């Protein structure tokens, strides 16, 4: 059993008022299933797309999660990840400094 | 119902006689000739022995009845018109029924030169690994050449037995080169099996050519043997590969 | 040089659910997919059936769908067989696919595991169990190698219709094999030291060159990230300095790539 | 024509049910059914004066009044292949047959795989096959290369019913490709 690792990113340069791709990047998990939910204030974003899942080199697997977004100065944008490797979801917060 | 030859060659200006025999009893005695968009024409006929009449078609033909159980037709000069497939048979007034039985035929060839005669040369081509692979099946090619007249039979034989399953051969040959009036023929016939069969080498492959030409009755004055009625054969073990 | 790629992701709950999913890659790019809520492989791309003819496709695919019900149908009576031994959750990967070399050369591959742990491959005319797989493992193999017919169609998928096939995709996408995309790169900062930050986004191909850059003076204590892809079959990629605080002056971030021609992106921290 | 045989050409599919015609110029004596094999042995099928004569698979019927006698196959085999004569007695009691029908039994060829095959000789030239193909597919021809028509498979065959062509030449290196478009 592998503990996920999750990656927030941008597509675009960060621009407040601007449409932009956050992605969410989770990797290294086994089994492959997984449940990823993408929040911006806290609530589920709804059409959120997903890649397909795939595995690296060491069968472990690793999918992303991507949507549309519009950064500001008054919203948070997170990824969560419920895993049986994990007790309790994991989220991970969109940082555009980090 | 018998008849012999079953198969002659001969010259144009030859005294060719073909031998009709039935054991039945039977009163009546008939020769026909086989030819395509006429199907069987009546040549001469017999209600018994001693008599004979014209049938149909009669010029260039005698026909002689002997005895009740053979019925003979003869070639005095025979001409490259009568090459043919000659069919005798019977008939019983005395079971009071119009039904024939008809022998096994018998194939004439008239040719301007016995020396035009030819016997088949024989090759076997092995399947194909890209069929094998792709069908997982596997097909063997025989392929007759340079045989003259047209008539010859082909067969197939796996391990010493005579095989009909998967056999596919031409209904007809091709002429070699069809711009010479005395050209060659060839005839090619396939045999599929499944791939495995093949690949096994305890598996002997063998297609096997019956040539019909020339008796011992005949006279041969050139270098090359015989162009006898004889069997030419190729063959081919399985192999892994 | 470009690698083909078939994965397999099977998966069995219990003796009554089961999900099998699918993907193919051609180099860091995706060709096909294929869920369970899908009857059929689905092309990603315009050139995915690759040289194949409309009936060669056809015929593969049909053999595919066939492979799906059978392998869900086989793996669910090895258990049976396994049992007590194993026990579901039972989680099984594929690994298929061929290497590609210039010229004709070719190295076509088989892996499979079991909860993660590579335990089988596909050699030569047969299923066999790689070194470290467990004892229980030989019993299933033998059922496998049964197959008679089986071993003809993965003989036939891995040495012929495999490097056939990659070879007619790697003619029908080069112009997608061989895309330049110019990169996009941002700085930022994180906090008496701080953290600077050179996110490099949008470049294709992967091999990328990015440095913290003091004059003509790398910076030794650049640390560059993992690369992790964009939704656009694109690479996303960060660098970052560790400085002391006032020794941000004079700080520039370096970008190196095939699609810029020589012309470096250079971002200075203000 | 006394005995008139229609088609001169029949091909049909196995396990069909078809039937074979005979009509007649003038009030004809009685009938007689052949089946002529690719061996050129004439078989008797059925002798009528009157009536129908079923014999397995195979039924005849023969009406004087009306001028004809029929022939009927049921759920056709490789088997029936071959030339079916019918011949009548006519005033005279001159039995007279008619041009012919030939009869070819083709199985249901499902999934076509048309491909054309390069195959080695046994000893130390080459030969091209065209195999896997429908019904409704045809053969071409031409010069110093040969072709076959498809060929006509063996009566007792029960398996492997697979039709296909053969092509060859007296030029080396021939190309196997072009020589089936
Ligand atoms: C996708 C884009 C096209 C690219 C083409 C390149 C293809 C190359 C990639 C090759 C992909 C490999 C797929 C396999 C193909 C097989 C196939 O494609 O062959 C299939 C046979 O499937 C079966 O009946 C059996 C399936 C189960 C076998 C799988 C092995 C099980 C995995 C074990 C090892 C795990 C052991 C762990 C035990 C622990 C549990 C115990 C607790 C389907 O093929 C069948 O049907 C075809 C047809 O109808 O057209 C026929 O043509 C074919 O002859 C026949 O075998
Ligand atoms: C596919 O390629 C393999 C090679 O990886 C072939 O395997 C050899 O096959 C022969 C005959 O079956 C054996 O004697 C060898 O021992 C095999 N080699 C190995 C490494 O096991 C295989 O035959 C090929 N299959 C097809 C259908 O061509
Ligand atoms: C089988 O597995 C599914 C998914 O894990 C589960 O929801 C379902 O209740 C299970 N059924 C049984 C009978 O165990
Ligand atoms: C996967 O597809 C098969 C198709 O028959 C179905 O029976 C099975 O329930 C599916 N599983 C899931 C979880 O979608």
């Known amino acids: 059993q592998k503990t996920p690792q999750i990656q927030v990113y941008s597509r675009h340069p960060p621009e407040n008022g601007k449409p932009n791709i956050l992605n969410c990047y989770v990797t290294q998990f086994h089994p492959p299933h997984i449940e990823i939910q993408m929040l911006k204030n806290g609530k589920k974003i709804p059409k959120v797309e997903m890649s397909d899942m795939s595995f690296s080199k060491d069968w472990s697997f690793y999918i992303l999660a991507h949507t549309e977004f519009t950064p500001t100065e008054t919203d948070t944008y997170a990824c969560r990840v419920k895993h049986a490797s994990m007790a309790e979801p994991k989220t991970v917060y969109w940082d555009r400094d980090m | 119902v018998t008849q012999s030859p079953r198969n002659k060659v001969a010259v144009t200006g030859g005294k060719v006689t073909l031998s009709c025999n039935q054991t039945?009893?039977?009163?009546?005695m008939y020769w026909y000739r086989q030819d395509t968009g006429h199907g069987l024409r009546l040549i001469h006929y017999?209600?018994?022995?001693?008599?004979?009449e014209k049938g149909d078609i009669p010029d260039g033909y005698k026909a002689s009845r002997p005895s009740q159980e053979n019925f003979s037709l003869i070639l005095e000069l025979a001409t490259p018109s009568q090459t043919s497939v000659y069919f005798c048979?019977?008939?019983?007034?005395?079971?009071?029924?119009?039904?024939?039985?008809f022998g096994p035929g018998t194939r004439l060839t008239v040719l301007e030169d016995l020396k035009n005669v030819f016997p088949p040369e024989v090759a076997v081509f092995e399947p194909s690994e890209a069929e094998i692979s792709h069908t997982q099946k596997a097909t063997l090619v025989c392929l007759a050449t340079g045989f003259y007249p047209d008539h010859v039979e082909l067969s197939w034989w796996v391990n010493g037995k005579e095989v009909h399953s998967g056999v596919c051969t031409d209904p007809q040959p091709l002429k070699e080169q069809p711009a010479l009036n005395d050209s060659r023929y060839a005839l090619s016939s396939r045999l599929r099996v499944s791939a495995t069969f093949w690949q096994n080498p305890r598996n002997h492959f063998r297609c096997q050519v019956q040539f019909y030409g020339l008796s011992e009755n005949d006279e041969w004055t050139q270098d090359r043997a015989k162009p006898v009625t004889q069997i030419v054969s190729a063959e081919a073990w399985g192999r892994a590969d | 040089n470009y690698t083909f790629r078939c994965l397999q992701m099977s998966s069995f709950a219990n003796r009554s659910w089961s999900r099998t999913d699918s993907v193919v890659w051609l180099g860091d790019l995706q060709t096909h997919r294929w869920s369970n809520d899908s009857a059929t492989i689905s092309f990603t791309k315009p050139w995915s059936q690759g040289k194949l003819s409309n009936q060669q496709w056809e015929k593969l695919q049909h053999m595919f769908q066939v492979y799906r019900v059978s392998f869900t149908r086989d793996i669910q009576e090895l258990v049976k067989m396994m049992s007590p031994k194993e026990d579901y959750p039972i989680e099984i990967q594929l690994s298929a696919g061929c290497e590609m070399y210039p010229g004709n050369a070719s190295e076509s591959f088989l892996h499979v595991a079991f909860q993660g742990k590579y335990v089988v491959r596909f050699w030569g005319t047969s299923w066999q169990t790689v070194p470290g797989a467990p004892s229980w493992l030989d019993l299933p193999i033998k059922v496998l190698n049964a197959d008679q017919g089986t071993s003809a169609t993965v003989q036939m998928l891995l040495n012929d219709t495999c490097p056939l096939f990659v070879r007619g995709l790697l003619e029908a996408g080069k112009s997608d094999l061989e895309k330049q995309e110019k990169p996009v790169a941002w700085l930022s900062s994180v906090p008496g030291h701080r953290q600077l930050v050179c996110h490099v986004s949008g470049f294709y191909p992967k091999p990328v060159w990015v440095m913290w850059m003091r004059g003509d003076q790398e910076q030794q204590g650049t640390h560059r990230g993992d690369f992790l892809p964009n939704a656009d079959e694109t690479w996303y990629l960060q660098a970052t300095l560790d400085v002391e605080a006032g020794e941000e002056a004079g700080l520039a971030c370096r970008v190196k790539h095939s699609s810029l021609g020589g012309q470096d992106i250079i971002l200075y921290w203000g | 024509m006394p005995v008139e045989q229609n088609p001169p050409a029949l091909s049909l599919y196995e396990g069909a049910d078809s039937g074979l015609r005979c009509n007649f110029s003038?009030?004809?004596?009685?009938v007689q059914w052949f089946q002529q094999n690719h061996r050129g042995r004439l078989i008797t099928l059925f002798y009528?004066?009157?009536g129908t004569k079923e014999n397995g698979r195979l039924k005849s019927t023969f009406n004087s009044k009306e001028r004809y006698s029929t022939l009927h196959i049921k759920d056709a085999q490789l088997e029936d292949s071959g030339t079916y004569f019918c011949?009548?007695?006519?005033?005279?009691?001159?039995?007279?047959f008619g041009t012919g029908t030939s009869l070819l039994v083709d199985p249901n060829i499902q999934n076509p795989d048309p491909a054309v095959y390069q195959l080695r000789d046994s000893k130390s030239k080459s030969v091209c096959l065209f195999t896997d193909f429908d019904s409704q597919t045809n053969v071409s021809q031409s010069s110093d290369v040969y072709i076959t028509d498809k060929c006509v498979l063996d009566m007792r065959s029960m398996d492997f019913k697979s039709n296909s062509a053969v092509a060859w030449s007296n030029k080396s290196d021939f190309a196997c490709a072009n020589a089936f478009n």
């Open positions: 009528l004066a009157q």
């Open positions: 017999s209600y018994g022995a001693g008599s004979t």
């Open positions: 039945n009893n039977h009163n009546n």
């Open positions: 011949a009548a007695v006519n005033m005279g009691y001159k039995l007279t």
């Open positions: 048979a019977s008939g019983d007034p005395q079971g009071v029924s119009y039904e024939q039985y």
């Open positions: 003038t009030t004809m004596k009685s």
